[PDB]
Design a protein around this ligand. Structure first.
Ligand code: NDP
Ligand code: ZMP
Ligand code: SF4
Ligand code: SF4
Ligand code: ZN
Lengths: 176, 126, 111, 208, 96, 114, 48, 95, 370, 287
């Protein structure tokens, strides 16, 4: 099935040819374009006042790279290296050790914010939902040193909020 | 069309562009990769991996990583026969160490021999 | 006709006898080609089939709907290129037996 | 076997089998393999001398039109003496079918520069010359396109590693950008993912 | 929108498309968020007692490609496919 | 053993094409060192050119010599145009160290470079 | 929060002066909201 | 809840605090070493050791498909509490 | 971003060398050193304006090699987002042609509509533009409840807005004077120079990969592709706008023909399972673990497929060892194929007409690199 | 000494080299080239500035990721200076404006600045402190500049005696002062014999001396290779450039060699002449 274009002829009848001559010598559809643009002038423009009104989103945005923890409990991560096994720019760096207790844990959990393409594979790959892509996207960092997260920065960034992260997950733990 | 051809050797190392430091200093090794002993399956056999020897990997003084000045450090070339391996290594110029293939030795075991009468091969447990 | 759907190709006025002298030149240049190969057989068979399509039909639009290669003048251009391969395949001897073999451990894939 | 597994048509398989047998019979001078996969896409495997004759046949003849030209690449396979594989890909406007003309070649001997009959092959051949080094005699212009000018090494080979040998940085010493031997900031770790235990019993090659 | 009638008439006179009706400023039919939590379905597997993986093993149905002529009075000269039938102008307002 | 060479029959045509290519590089140098507003004497540039020629004099295989001639012709074209900038032309030179000598004891101080 | 504006102008914050002490009457940053209001203000919900 | 080494800065919940001869202390000049001030081992004694009347019992983690997977732990050690490797919270038996 | 060295007789031309390769990134090499599931976003972003049809072609390449058919709801949702991607790429090509030709404002009108479409992508996955979201093995993590009615609303309002775009332009007199006489293409040129899609629609031959070889459930919706007659750039513009309107048709019929099957395949050795069975299984946890570490093994062989990107024949050619890593991927790019014939398309015009020629074949200059 | 101060592997781009250098100045000319050659060596440079961060911003990306570090200093307090030199392997002192300001003379920058930094350095325990000086800065007349530099020379020689007191001649380069004044002319003609030394041999000598131990205690002086008349050099400048009071007195004052102290030859660096680099740098003339 096909529906092509540009198959006509200029009509040799006197009315159509004098109408094309009237458009040629009278600048008509140009003024029709001016009328359409003035109709968009008299609309109200759709802008948002940026520092006061922030643009809408989804409950599943991928931002901050925050961590979670157990209810009144310890660190949610096990250092099971799945996120570094899936990290498609290898920005995760995990060096693991157990502590004096016996449960297996970490030493070094580094996210490179340069290499992080923000897939979501480390969120989907985490069996205990330790790393969660965060809600807010404001990094804006004046120095390149400061864009290399440490595990303690991630724990502070996961302890500046969980209630946002918990609300988003508790809303959408059923799709994924 | 039935032209000059002369039966000689090959000198591709003046064409592949890798510098002569990495040509004459670094050394290759051709080996069948051994079975990773915790599993017992030899599908990881039947290939002849060509690798290069390891070199220095210091500490990255800001994050604790292992940087290296070695572009060739993560090469591997899985082959199918020792002859083409040696031919390619001599074709591309650098030196090479050949380790020979070692199959598992065929044995002679049986359950009735594990239930011997006056032979000491006895299961002693089951 | 009148202003066919292609672009760099204006309609011809005598398609039939032009196409027929094209295919008789195909038969001539095929008559140059030696006998025992089946290349002559397949080209002769398809050319006689297509000539039998065209000789039995003095129509235009029924001739397009029967003879494939829509609409019409692509058959003429394709006949020119078929003559081009005919001229290029007096030479180059495609029907003669093979030149030497690969080392035979090459076309098997899984390495 | 029927749900969530893609069914096939044996009719197209028989059609491509008969067509490939026909082409193999009527161009015997260069045909070595005519292989058909399970899902009916034809492969014709060709000696590197009948490039121009086979492509002049396959552009025409009113039984295999195949005007549409696609990819050209020469898949770098070691453990061979003829390393590189020039892969022509052809699509028929009239018949809706895909044939893969795989001709084989070595490192230094040219195949015969298909741009004479295929005007789409010009930058394809220039790309293959830039990335590999497969020379193309009787060609109008061979240059380096899709690489840097001062860079060399033919990087899509397997001998060229992942990182380049050179790495640029600006310096205020000579007030310009210079190239240095590569100083990576991290390793590009190498995961030995080639697991054993023979996931496909049908594709077993005979061992020694 | 949210404007008086004289300038509305000037908008509809400069463009007679009934601009007040659909204006690309969404007010009512924004999707009402915090939806009820969905329960996903599971498709034609987890079906007990019949799901032999031996059947639906599409990875292992990969045959090796069959071979015709090699390096080691016939009713023929068919096409690879039946020749393609020419289409039709669709009735839904073609040109012309 | 059938091998189709590029251009060569013996090394006579190899010598002929490489001496003509060196003549082209000789008349290539002063125009470029005037055009790119460079900062290097003509003697030093010509001596580094002939040093780069004298680096690969150890090749007797004629196909390799043909491919070297074709590569040098490519870069002579790309420098006789204005396609290559100041950066690549200085990148042929080495004015930024790179100080590494071939002494044993020097490589023994800054170690692990055998 | 007002209803008669469109979707994008419902929920707007008005920042105050020196909540951390950096003279933020002017030069108002982002992320000066607590996180539950960062759920509310980014239109992820319909309830305060 | 942190120690203060004779270097003089905040220690962490990993034994990685510095020596006096370091330059990394002086590259910490001007910007504070931010650390999580809510440690891990101290949030184990805060959790009460639960006592379940059964023998071979369950651990999930407070939520179906929200947490760590199921693990069934034993209580045959008469004086030693069962410890989930994932959770870190204890269990006892009451006959 | 390109380099163009043109040699011209005055306010006219003679020849032009497009120096391309400025935006070379090494994508095929990086995919040769990675797995399938990890290196899917390289296929997502080699082209960037069309963004989910590339996902669609790579996923159908892996499913066609792996002989596994997705569930039907996954197919219809993939058709819906392919139509969204088709609509988006054609409308951005129209607006960037308008902005480069002049014509400041309809750019911004249709980009407000595209801002609604990026809000839809956000609500689907979360990403603004480069949502991966299409695993090989069907669509992953399906849509939240309350999306299809929003797409219905967009369909009505966007039919109104595209009719207002044809109100503004299209019988614009001087834009017609600007682009009618330029860009002639012979059918022999359209065959030999290897053109793809919209050029073949515009110059002569009726040709659709979607219609001829239906690679999905496109065979069960009534639509009619617009064809060209004169082989011309204004004619090609009309072809693009009517392909957008056909995409409106296919969106309407797709919303009316939706079956509620399932998200992914029921073959857990290819697609990962979901969270409930993941947190209480054993086989599903093992499959999760090893499927994300190693990547599933792919049987050896070389396949090719091609779907209709809004540029043209987006082809992908996979070459697989029996492995979890592809041995060699390669991409047939309609941008590269369209840029290939620039001398013969612009032998007889001037430089602003050359800029209009670069406009009238939709360009991203990322996909032209391969 | 602790690890991560020992050298590691090859050189360049965050290869961990030996020295950790606290640099005073480095926003000017010679300090900027010195930070450049230490970044080529791959050495961590701690530099405090006092000015706007835009100047240290356009000399920022010389190092690799996070190698060099920026902080603050002032010419009044020992606390900020001591905080800048808390942990340092080596330290270099380069400072000085060639005209008096409202708040600083030629006195007390050259006098008061090495006093406090040498005080906190010797109380800190730094090694291989390199202090620059102008050549032939005497107790003699004609310059508050030269006599305050001689007082600073006596200070750095007396307290912390094993400092490398270094002096080049008047250096020329891309951002020279006196060749710029030769360009920024109008005139007058005098006589003075003079040897110019190019800047990159000077800073190569400084980095080689600071990375090579056992060469300490001795003051060094750098020598120009030509050593001819100033007015012939001005004619040379106008010829190569195609066109026909404190600074001019301090270039007409004194230019001699001193046989006491060792120079280039105890370091092993090739001397670049005036002619080659002068042809390289004399751009920006008429076409
Ligand atoms: N031919 C020559 O020019 C020769 C020069 N020298 C010496 O080399 C040194 C460097 O020369 P040059 O680069 O040309 O000159 P500069 O003035 O540019 O170098 C001095 C540096 O210290 C800073 N500085 C100077 N005075 C003060 C102050 N009162 N408070 C704070 N910072 C100050 C300068 O500016 P800022 O504060 O913005 O950082 C600059 O960073 C000088 O001491 C000079 O005597 C030696 C031999 C030859
Ligand atoms: C800025 C500077 C410009 C760039 C500088 C680098 C240019 C790089 C050019 C590279 C070209 C080459 O190196 S090809 C060198 C060819 N060498 C050979 O040995 C070829 C074979 N010929 C020979 O062996 C002999 O002809 C000899 C021994 C070289 C000469 O013998 P004559 O005596 O009978
Ligand atoms: S996948 Fe989750 S639990 Fe495992 S190492 Fe990564 S963050 Fe930790
Ligand atoms: S989102 Fe970032 S950290 Fe996570 S897998 Fe992707 S690149 Fe790695
Ligand atoms: Zn538990």
């Amino acid at each position: 099935t096909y529906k092509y274009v540009n198959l006509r002829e200029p009509s040799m009848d006197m009315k159509s040819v004098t109408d094309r001559a009237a458009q040629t010598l009278l600048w008509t559809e140009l003024i029709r374009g001016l009328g359409m643009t003035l109709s968009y002038l008299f609309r109200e423009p759709a802008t948002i006042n940026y520092p006061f009104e922030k643009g809408p989103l989804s409950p599943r945005f991928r931002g901050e790279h925050a961590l979670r923890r157990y209810p009144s409990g310890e660190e949610r991560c096990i250092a099971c290296k799945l996120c570094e096994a899936v990290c498609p720019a290898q920005a995760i760096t995990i060096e693991a050790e157990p502590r004096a207790d016996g449960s297996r844990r970490t030493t070094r959990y580094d996210i490179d914010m340069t290499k992080c393409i923000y897939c979501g594979f480390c969120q989907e790959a985490c069996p205990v939902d330790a790393i969660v892509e965060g809600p807010n996207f404001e990094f804006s960092t004046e120095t390149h040193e400061e864009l290399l997260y440490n595990k303690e920065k991630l724990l502070n960034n996961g302890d500046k909020w969980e209630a946002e992260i918990a609300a988003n997950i508790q809303a959408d733990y059923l799709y994924r | 069309t039935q032209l000059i051809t002369v039966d000689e050797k090959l000198d591709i190392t003046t064409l592949t562009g890798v510098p002569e430091e990495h040509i004459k200093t670094r050394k290759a090794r051709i080996f069948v990769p051994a079975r990773n002993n915790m599993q017992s399956g030899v599908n990881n056999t039947k290939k002849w991996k060509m690798e290069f020897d390891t070199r220095e990997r210091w500490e990255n003084p800001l994050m604790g990583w292992a940087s290296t000045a070695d572009p060739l450090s993560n090469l591997v070339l899985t082959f199918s026969t020792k002859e083409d391996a040696i031919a390619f290594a001599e074709k591309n110029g650098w030196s090479y160490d050949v380790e020979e293939r070692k199959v598992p030795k065929p044995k002679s075991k049986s359950y009735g021999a594990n239930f011997s009468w006056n032979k000491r091969t006895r299961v002693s447990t089951k | 006709k009148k202003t066919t759907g292609l672009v760099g190709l204006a309609v011809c006025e005598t398609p039939h006898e032009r196409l027929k002298i094209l295919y008789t030149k195909i038969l001539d240049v095929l008559g140059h080609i030696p006998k025992n190969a089946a290349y002559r057989k397949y080209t002769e068979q398809i050319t006689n089939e297509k000539l039998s399509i065209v000789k039995a039909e003095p129509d235009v639009k029924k001739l397009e709907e029967q003879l494939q290669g829509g609409q019409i003048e692509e058959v003429i251009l394709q006949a020119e290129n078929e003559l081009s391969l005919a001229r290029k395949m007096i030479q180059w001897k495609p029907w003669e037996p093979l030149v030497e073999e690969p080392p035979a451990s090459q076309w098997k894939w899984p390495i | 076997t029927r749900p969530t597994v893609r069914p096939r048509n044996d009719v197209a398989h028989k059609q491509l089998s008969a067509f490939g047998e026909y082409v193999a019979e009527i161009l015997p001078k260069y045909v070595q393999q005519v292989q058909v996969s399970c899902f009916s896409e034809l492969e014709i495997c060709i000696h590197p001398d009948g490039v121009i004759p086979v492509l002049t046949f396959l552009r025409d003849h009113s039984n295999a039109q195949f005007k549409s030209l696609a990819d050209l690449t020469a898949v770098d396979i070691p453990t061979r003496q003829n390393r590189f594989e020039i892969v022509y890909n052809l699509l028929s406007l009239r018949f809706n079918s895909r044939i893969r003309v795989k001709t084989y070649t070595d490192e230094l001997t040219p195949v015969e520069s298909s741009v004479s009959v295929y005007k789409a092959a010009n930058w394809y051949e220039r790309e293959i010359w830039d990335m590999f080094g497969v020379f193309f005699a009787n060609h109008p212009d061979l240059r380096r396109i899709l690489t840097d000018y001062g860079f060399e090494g033919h990087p899509f080979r397997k001998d060229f590693p992942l990182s380049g040998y050179v790495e640029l940085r600006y310096d205020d010493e000579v007030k310009r950008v210079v190239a240095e031997p590569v100083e990576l900031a991290q390793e590009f770790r190498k995961f030995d993912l080639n697991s054993p235990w023979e996931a496909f019993p049908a594709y077993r090659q005979p061992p020694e | 929108a949210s404007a008086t009638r004289l300038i509305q008439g000037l908008r509809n006179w400069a463009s007679g498309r009934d601009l007040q009706a659909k204006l690309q400023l969404r007010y009512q039919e924004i999707s009402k968020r915090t939806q009820p939590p969905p329960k996903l379905p599971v498709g034609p597997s987890h079906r007990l007692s019949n799901n032999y993986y031996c059947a639906r093993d599409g990875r292992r149905e990969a045959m090796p490609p069959s071979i015709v002529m090699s390096s080691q009075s016939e009713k023929k000269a068919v096409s690879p496919a039946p020749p393609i039938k020419r289409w039709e102008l669709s009735q839904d307002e073609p040109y012309l | 053993t059938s091998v189709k060479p590029i251009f060569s029959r013996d090394m006579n045509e190899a010598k002929r094409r490489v001496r003509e290519l060196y003549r082209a590089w000789y008349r290539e140098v002063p125009n470029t060192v005037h055009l790119f507003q460079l900062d290097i004497s003509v003697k030093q540039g010509r001596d580094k050119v002939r040093e780069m020629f004298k680096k690969n004099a150890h090749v007797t295989d004629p196909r390799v010599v043909d491919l070297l001639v074709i590569k040098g012709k490519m870069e002579l074209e790309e420098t006789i145009n204005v396609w290559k900038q100041r950066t690549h032309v200085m990148r042929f030179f080495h004015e930024t160290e790179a100080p590494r000598p071939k002494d044993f004891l020097s490589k023994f101080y800054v170690g692990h470079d055998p | 929060e007002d209803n008669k504006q469109f979707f994008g102008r419902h929920r707007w914050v008005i920042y105050t002066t020196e909540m951390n002490g950096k003279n933020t009457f002017w030069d108002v940053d982002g992320s000066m909201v607590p996180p539950e209001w960062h759920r509310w203000l980014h239109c992820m919900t319909d309830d305060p | 809840g942190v120690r203060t080494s004779p270097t003089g800065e905040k220690v962490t919940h990993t034994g990685q605090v510095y020596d006096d001869e370091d330059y990394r202390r002086v590259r910490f000049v001007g910007r504070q070493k931010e650390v999580n001030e809510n440690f891990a081992i101290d949030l184990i004694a805060e959790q009460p050791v639960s006592q379940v009347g059964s023998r071979v019992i369950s651990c999930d983690g407070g939520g179906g498909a929200l947490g760590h997977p199921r693990v069934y732990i034993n209580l045959d050690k008469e004086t030693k509490t069962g410890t989930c490797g994932y959770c870190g919270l204890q269990f006892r038996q009451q006959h | 971003v390109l380099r163009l060295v043109m040699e011209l007789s005055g306010e006219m031309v003679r020849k032009c060398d497009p120096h391309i390769g400025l935006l070379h990134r090494g994508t095929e090499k990086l995919i040769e050193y990675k797995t399938y599931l990890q290196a899917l976003p390289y296929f997502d972003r080699l082209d960037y304006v069309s963004m989910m049809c590339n996902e669609q072609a790579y996923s159908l390449a892996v499913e066609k090699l792996l002989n596994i058919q997705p569930p039907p709801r996954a197919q219809w949702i993939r058709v819906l987002f392919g139509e969204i991607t088709r609509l988006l790429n054609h409308i951005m090509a129209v607006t960037t042609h308008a902005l480069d030709i002049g014509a400041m404002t309809p750019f911004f009108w249709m980009f407000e509509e595209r801002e609604k479409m990026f809000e839809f992508y956000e609500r689907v996955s979360g990403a603004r533009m480069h949502a991966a979201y299409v695993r090989p093995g069907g669509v992953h993590q399906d849509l939240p409840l309350g999306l299809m009615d929003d797409i219905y609303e967009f369909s009505k309002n966007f039919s109104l807005r595209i009719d207002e775009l044809e109100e503004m332009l299209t019988n614009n007199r001087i834009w017609r004077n600007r682009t009618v006489d330029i860009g002639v293409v012979t059918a022999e040129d359209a065959l030999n120079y290897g053109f793809s899609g919209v050029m073949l629609r515009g110059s002569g031959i009726q040709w659709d990969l979607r219609k001829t070889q239906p690679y999905d459930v496109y065979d069960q919706v009534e639509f009619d592709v617009p064809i060209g007659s004169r082989g011309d750039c204004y004619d090609r513009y009309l072809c693009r706008v009517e392909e957008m309107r056909q995409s409106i048709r296919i969106i309407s019929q797709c919303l009316n023909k939706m079956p509620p099957g399932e998200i992914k395949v029921d073959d857990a050795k290819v697609s990962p399972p979901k969270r409930a069975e993941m947190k209480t299984s054993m086989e599903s946890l093992i499959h999760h673990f090893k499927l994300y570490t190693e990547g599933y093994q792919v049987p050896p062989g070389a396949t090719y497929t091609a779907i209709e990107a809004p540029k043209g024949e987006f082809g992908v050619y996979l070459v697989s060892d029996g492995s979890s890593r592809p041995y060699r991927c390669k991409i047939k790019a309609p941008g590269f194929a369209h840029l290939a014939g620039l001398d013969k398309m612009s032998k007889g015009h001037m430089l602003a007409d050359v800029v209009a020629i670069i406009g009238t074949q939709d360009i991203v200059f990322g996909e032209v690199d391969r | 000494l602790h690890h991560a101060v020992i050298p590691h592997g090859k050189g360049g781009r965050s290869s961990v080299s030996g020295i950790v250098a606290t640099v005073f100045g480095a926003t000017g000319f010679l300090g900027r080239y010195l930070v450049n050659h230490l970044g080529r060596m791959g050495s961590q440079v701690i530099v405090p500035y006092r000015c706007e961060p835009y100047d240290t911003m356009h000399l920022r990306p010389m190092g690799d990721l996070g190698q060099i570090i920026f902080m603050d200093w002032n010419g009044r307090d020992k606390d900020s200076i001591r905080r800048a030199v808390e942990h340092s392997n080596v330290v270099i002192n380069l400072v000085g404006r060639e005209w008096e300001t409202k708040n600083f003379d030629f006195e007390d920058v050259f006098v008061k600045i090495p006093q406090a930094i040498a005080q906190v350095s010797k109380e800190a325990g730094v090694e291989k402190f390199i202090h620059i000086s102008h050549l032939n800065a005497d107790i003699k007349s004609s310059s508050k500049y030269l006599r305050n530099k001689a007082v600073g020379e006596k200070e750095v020689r007396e307290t912390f005696p094993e400092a490398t007191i270094i002096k080049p001649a008047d250096i020329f380069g891309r951002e020279d002062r006196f060749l710029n004044y030769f360009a920024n002319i109008r005139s007058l003609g005098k006589k003075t014999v003079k040897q110019p030394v190019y800047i990159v041999d000077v800073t190569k000598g400084i980095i080689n001396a600071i990375k090579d131990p056992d060469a300490r205690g001795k003051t060094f002086a750098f020598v120009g290779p030509n050593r001819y008349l100033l007015f012939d050099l001005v004619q040379y400048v106008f010829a190569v450039a195609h066109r026909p009071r404190d600074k001019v007195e301090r270039i007409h004052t004194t230019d001699r060699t001193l046989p006491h102290l060792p120079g280039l030859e105890d370091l092993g660096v090739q001397a670049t002449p005036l002619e080659l680099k002068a042809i390289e740098v004399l751009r920006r003339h008429r076409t």
